[PDB]
């Protein structure tokens, strides 16, 4: 590994620096090296990892969607014919799949099996689900169903742990629920399940708000607002 000669703490520091500079590819490389040091990650470190790879793969997904729309247009009725569009969409798609495989390899070697506390275990299983979902977004062949089911399984195990070990307003539980609802709506062709999950999540969080101190849950009300945005869009 290119980072095997840098101190873990130095990798964390440089990941924060890269975050400040919005150099998310560097951030991802640094946090990958940190993970490969072999020690479990603190709450702050998991956040850095997730943020870095989320931004990298988000850019990749947006580019893939631009190119896929162009490709679809190029295969309509009356559209003038070469292979360039397909080739470049395949290039972006292959790079995207590489990043997703890298993150899943990190989770499987060996973040999840050493994750014993609810916070971290749910975090990692949500991330596994997220990246299998990103793989599902572009899958078209004999593996689509298995990729979708891997995403579902990871999300479901995370849900079972969060419901049992976390309060309804925990930001991790809320983000997991948001993304699992988006899985149901956009991947699993199950919009009614997506709506039901979003509504139940929002209602339970709403009912638990009264136990929280004010300045200590900005992210939770933020994510409840995202749940409400999705509900407004879908109904």
């Amino acid at each position: 590994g290119a980072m095997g000669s840098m101190e873990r703490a130095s990798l964390i520091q440089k990941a924060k620096l890269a975050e400040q500079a919005e150099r998310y590819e560097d951030m991802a490389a640094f946090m990958k090296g940190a993970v490969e040091k072999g020690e479990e990650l603190s709450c702050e470190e998991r956040n850095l990892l997730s943020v870095a790879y989320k931004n990298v793969v988000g850019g990749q997904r947006a580019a893939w969607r631009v190119l896929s729309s162009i490709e679809q247009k190029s295969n309509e009725e009356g559209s003038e014919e070469g292979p360039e569009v397909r080739e470049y969409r395949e290039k972006v798609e292959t790079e995207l799949q590489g990043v997703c495989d890298t993150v899943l390899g990190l989770l499987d070697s060996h973040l999840i099996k050493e994750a014993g506390d609810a916070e971290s275990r749910v975090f990692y299983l949500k991330m596994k689900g997220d990246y299998y979902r990103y793989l599902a977004e572009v899958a078209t062949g004999d593996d689509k169903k298995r990729i979708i089911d891997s995403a579902r399984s990871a999300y479901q195990e995370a849900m079972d742990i969060s419901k049992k070990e976390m309060p309804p307003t925990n930001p991790i539980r809320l983000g997991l629920a948001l993304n699992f609802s988006v899985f149901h709506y956009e991947i699993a062709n199950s919009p009614e399940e997506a709506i039901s999950l979003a509504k139940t999540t929002f209602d339970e969080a709403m009912a638990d708000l009264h136990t929280l101190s004010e300045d200590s849950y900005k992210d939770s009300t933020l994510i409840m607002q995202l749940l409400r945005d999705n509900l407004t869009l879908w109904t």
């Binding site: 997220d130 948001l178 988006v182 709506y185 956009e186 995202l226 749940l227 945005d229 999705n230 869009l233």
Partner: peptide, 5 residues
């Protein structure tokens, strides 16, 4: 645009 986090 589906909201995810």
């Amino acid at each position: 645009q589906n909201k995810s986090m």
